[PDB]
Design a protein around this ligand. Structure first.
Ligand SMILES: Nc1ncnc2c1ncn2[C@@H]1O[C@H](COP(=O)(O)OP(=O)(O)OP(=O)(O)O)[C@@H](O)[C@H]1O
Ligand SMILES: Nc1ncnc2c1ncn2[C@@H]1O[C@H](COP(=O)(O)OP(=O)(O)OP(=O)(O)O)[C@@H](O)[C@H]1O
Ligand SMILES: [Mg+2]
Ligand SMILES: [Mg+2]
Lengths: 98, 356, 262, 81, 51, 109
């Protein structure tokens, strides 16, 4: 075929059936946001600049949600799903980890 | 014959799509008589069908237009005078200054009357003789010589539409709105021609240097390209081009001062000779109540440099000080005191007089 | 009464605010919405077509975008924090030792408010614009503080550096409001402290940060005196040192009195 | 006995509307009973305020929640920085 | 007749899906084109079969 | 109060003792973090820091190395920066009396 190919076209057949199960599941998309204030409830800010007060996901304890932390929220009614590792600057200083 | 009646009745039905609400676009340019290009005020361009039986003569010159919200179809047209953020003043906001309040600078008065006034009243003279008409007018000079005050006078006399914009109305906060201000302002002039556009200070928009990385700069570049484009489109109208002032001359973009755009450069001096100084003192002092003992001739010799705005301040100060003494007139004691303050001009020989 | 008030409250719904950009016809006006898009909207039969003209601010149903009612003019939240300030009173003899500068400041601020008939006699146009400058710590803010609790006119208090915003030209909109607010409530005073932040020198070779400042400074010049003259609005500047102020602002006439406090 | 049943019945309908999540705003002005809020989606709505959330608490610029489905002042939010 | 067949059927054509203006940045040999709608980003999208 | 002297005499140490002993609110701030490259985002941070200090009152704001908000002595016509300048002058208006400077003490080192 050699159109929309980027692999050895042998492990991508099996990968093709695996991606159908991930497309049906909503592990993604998760819109990436960041916390601004924990309210003993959270004050989330989206990147498209519009702020929301959200609840809590059934995936995670509230112990793991911290100040300023990057968090993924639902595509629809915004709810905190998964904590993420911080820092968006890493793209010059990540290049020098030897 | 029966089909001529039904074409009328069946044409009332497409006319009933025009309804509240509508979203406003601006007809950019044609590409067919059944399709054109619009640019919504949302920031999006669209290529949409035109509605049958609409004026194809009036769409082409950039005009505001109506869209139907839920498809962006071009269901009808709006007037050319409408949807203008900034409208023609003059109803009663026209300033009170006139050529009589203005004093000296007689050379400048003559130039600008020849640059702005004579083309409107008599276009024919310029063609006959075979000179190119001075088009755009530029005013530079060091701050406070009466650049704006000479333009106030001109707003009264002309009896032609007048559109007055600060240079900061063009910087918007949302998007593409800078380009949208320029496009409106030039159309509005052409519509109620002949017309004068005045940008009080154009300096920040006409800057010489751009980083072209920060968003802020990338948005000014668009405003400045549009101004240059429509400055050449202005040609072959009754309109006299934009007249604009800046107290800075080193920072100007030289892309404005190429020929065919801004042509005539006016100068306003800071230096005042002895004759031209007495002329300014004469007009301010004729309004005010003075003793006949006081005399302007005593003043003019002392300073060898002074400008029309420093003189304005001196008269205020002599007339403010007259209130402390409680004197109807400005006595020559007040006039002298007020002269020595708001002059200075000593930084260079202040204590370094041994250079002579 | 309060828990039944929530049930009835949920039947109401917000209304997108706009302003009348220009009367097209008596049936349909053009309104610009605060969200952004310009619309052509209908009218209610209750609303007086004679109060709907260019400039007035209206509200819209979000269902139909049809004019629901007239609204008075609304003061931005920035300009409300600037009037909020000033608490308590400081005596006007509690400033002492500078009794001469207090009187030269009243020649500009107190006098033309009460008796514009005296300045009409001589024939001179009243002075506006006062520049306070002196060594740091001499009391240039104390003088302005005392006189703004005393006089009784509406008083906008503005840290010069507190009106800069990140977004493009948002700093332009603020300065226009302050003069629009003041022109409305008049007689009023606008006082700006430490005006080196935005009265900086010319530059035009520096970064983009310098180029944004140049745009608010260019505007502040044409707001004091352009075509339209201020009314009973008086403007007081305070600075640590006048040397680093742009020459177009310092200029006699634009800020008439230049009071030195020793 | 009837006053205790009124406050439990109306509270089941307040708790359904108070459901998370909900947009954030601040109050550009209280007309003073009206609140014009400027939402954090950068538009402006006028509304006759919810009489449960007092006009006393509200001073310009303070944060309030707003029900995203239909713009009502749902609650008052703690000030934060 | 060309008129009246057009007027009646015109209402169904005016419920348009809209259109956009991009510009060809570069093509690739999958028959796809990279075009930029100006306010937004860029899109890789295929040509209709006919052109 | 201001602390000035040779490096290594323990100006930072002394402030650290004060933080643990007084059981007042201790807001650590570093003067170069305050400076920000966005246009006027560094000014917004000064006002937010003193506003937070009103709630938690009484407070101590300890600023380190005030050399990042440097000195105002420039006025050139070619460049001049004038960024560090703006956020320094915002800091002076919070040290003034309009803002309560009686609930908030400042340790400068
Ligand atoms: N020839 C003159 N006759 C009478 N008055 C004058 C003359 N020149 C200047 N003035 C006085 O000086 C004032 C200042 O003038 P103006 O504000 O127009 O200066 P400008 O050139 O616009 O300065 P800027 O650089 O600030 O724009 C005028 O309002 C007027 O009262
Ligand atoms: N002339 C004065 N008489 C009495 N007290 C004074 C005088 N000048 C200054 N003070 C004292 O100084 C304090 C603050 O001075 P102030 O803030 O007015 O100085 P400043 O010139 O405004 O400083 P900056 O240059 O930083 O703006 C006042 O609260 C008062 O106690
Ligand atoms: Mg001018
Ligand atoms: Mg240290």
């Amino acid at each position: 075929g050699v159109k929309e190919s980027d692999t050895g076209l042998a492990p991508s057949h099996l990968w093709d059936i695996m991606g159908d199960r991930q497309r049906l599941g909503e592990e993604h998309p998760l819109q990436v946001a960041r916390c601004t204030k924990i309210i003993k409830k959270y004050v989330i800010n989206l990147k498209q600049i519009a702020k929301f007060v959200v609840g809590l996901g059934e995936r995670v304890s509230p112990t793991d949600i911290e100040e300023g932390m990057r968090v993924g929220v639902d595509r629809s009614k915004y709810n905190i799903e998964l904590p993420l590792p911080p820092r968006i600057d890493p793209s010059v200083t990540m290049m020098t980890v030897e | 014959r029966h089909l001529k009646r039904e074409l009328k009745r069946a044409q009332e039905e497409v006319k009933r799509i025009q309804s509240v609400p509508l979203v406003i676009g601006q007809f950019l340019e044609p590409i067919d008589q059944n399709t054109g290009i619009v640019s919504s005020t949302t920031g999006m361009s669209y290529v949409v069908r035109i509605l049958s039986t609409l004026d194809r003569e009036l769409l082409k010159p950039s005009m505001s237009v109506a869209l139907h919200r839920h498809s962006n179809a071009l269901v009808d047209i709006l007037p050319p005078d409408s949807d203008s953020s900034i409208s023609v003043m003059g109803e009663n906001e026209k300033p009170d200054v006139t050529y009589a309040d203005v004093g000296g600078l007689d050379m400048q008065k003559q130039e600008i009357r020849e640059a702005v006034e004579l083309p409107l009243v008599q276009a024919d003279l310029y063609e006959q003789i075979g000179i190119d008409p001075p088009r755009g007018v530029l005013l530079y000079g060091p701050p406070g010589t009466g650049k704006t005050m000479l333009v106030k006078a001109v707003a009264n006399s002309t009896k032609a539409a007048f559109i007055r914009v600060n240079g900061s109305e063009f910087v918007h906060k949302y998007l593409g709105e800078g380009p949208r201000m320029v496009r409106d302002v030039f159309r509005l002039a052409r519509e109620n021609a002949p017309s004068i556009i005045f940008i009080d200070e154009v300096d920040s928009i006409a800057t010489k240097r751009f980083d072209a990385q920060t968003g802020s700069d990338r948005e000014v570049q668009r405003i400045l390209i549009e101004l240059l484009t429509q400055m050449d489109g202005f040609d072959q109208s009754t309109n006299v081009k934009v007249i604009m002032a800046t107290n800075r001359a080193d920072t100007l973009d030289p892309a404005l001062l190429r020929p065919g755009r801004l042509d005539r450069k006016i100068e306003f001096p800071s230096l005042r000779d002895r004759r031209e100084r007495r002329l300014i003192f004469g007009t301010i002092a004729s309004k005010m109540s003075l003793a006949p003992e006081a005399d302007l001739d005593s003043l003019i010799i002392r300073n060898d440099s002074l400008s029309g705005a420093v003189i304005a301040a001196i008269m205020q100060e002599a007339g403010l000080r007259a209130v402390r003494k409680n004197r109807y007139v400005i006595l020559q004691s007040d006039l002298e005191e007020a002269y020595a303050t708001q002059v200075k001009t000593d930084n260079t020989v202040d204590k370094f007089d041994f250079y002579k | 009464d309060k828990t039944e008030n929530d049930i009835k409250a949920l039947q109401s719904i917000g209304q997108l605010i706009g302003e009348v950009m220009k009367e097209l016809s008596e049936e349909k006006y053009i309104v610009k919405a605060s969200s952004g898009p310009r619309y052509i909207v209908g009218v209610r039969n209750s609303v007086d077509r004679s109060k709907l003209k260019k400039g007035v601010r209206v509200t819209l149903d979000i269902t139909t975008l049809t004019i629901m009612r007239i609204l008075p003019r609304e003061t931005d939240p920035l300009v409300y924090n600037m009037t909020s300030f000033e608490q308590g009173e400081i005596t006007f003899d509690g400033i002492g030792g500078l009794t001469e500068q207090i009187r030269e400041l009243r020649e500009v601020i107190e006098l033309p408010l009460k008796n514009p008939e005296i300045f009409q006699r001589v024939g001179i146009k009243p002075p506006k614009g006062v520049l306070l400058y002196g060594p740091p710590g001499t009391g240039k803010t104390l003088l302005a503080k005392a006189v703004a609790a005393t006089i009784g006119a509406n008083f906008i208090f503005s840290p010069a550096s507190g009106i800069v915003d990140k977004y493009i030209g948002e700093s332009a909109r603020i300065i226009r409001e302050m003069f629009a607010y003041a022109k409305e409530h008049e007689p009023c005073i606008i006082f700006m402290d430490e005006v080196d932040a935005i009265g900086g020198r010319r530059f035009s070779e520096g970064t983009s940060a310098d180029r944004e400042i140049q745009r608010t400074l260019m505007e502040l010049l044409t707001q004091m005196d352009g075509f339209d003259n201020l009314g009973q609005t008086k403007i007081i500047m305070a600075t640590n040192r006048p040397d680093t102020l742009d020459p177009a602002l310092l200029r006699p006439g634009r800020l008439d009195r230049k009071v030195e406090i020793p | 006995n009837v006053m205790l049943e009124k406050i439990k019945d109306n509270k089941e309908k307040i708790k359904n509307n108070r459901q998370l999540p909900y947009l954030v705003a601040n109050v550009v002005e209280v007309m003073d009973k009206a609140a014009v809020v400027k939402t954090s989606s950068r538009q402006t709505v006028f509304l006759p305020m919810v009489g449960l959330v007092d006009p006393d608490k509200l001073k310009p610029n303070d944060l309030v929640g707003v029900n995203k489905d239909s713009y009502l002042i749902l609650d008052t939010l703690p000030s934060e920085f | 007749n060309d008129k009246v067949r057009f007027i009646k059927d015109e209402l169904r054509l005016l419920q348009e899906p809209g259109s956009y203006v991009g510009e060809v940045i570069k093509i690739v040999s999958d028959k796809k084109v990279l075009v930029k709608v100006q306010p937004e980003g860029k899109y890789i999208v295929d040509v209709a079969k006919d052109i | 109060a201001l602390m000035y002297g040779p490096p290594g005499t323990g100006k930072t140490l002394l402030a650290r003792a004060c933080a643990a002993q007084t059981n007042a609110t201790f807001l650590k701030l570093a003067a170069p973090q305050l400076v920000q490259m966005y246009i006027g985002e560094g000014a917004k941070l000064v006002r937010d820091a003193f506003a937070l200090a009103k709630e938690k009152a009484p407070t101590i704001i300890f600023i380190d190395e005030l050399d990042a908000i440097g000195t105002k002595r420039f006025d050139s016509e070619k460049s001049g920066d004038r960024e560090v300048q703006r956020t320094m002058l915002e800091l002076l208006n919070q040290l003034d009396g309009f803002s309560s400077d009686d609930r908030v003490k400042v340790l400068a080192a």
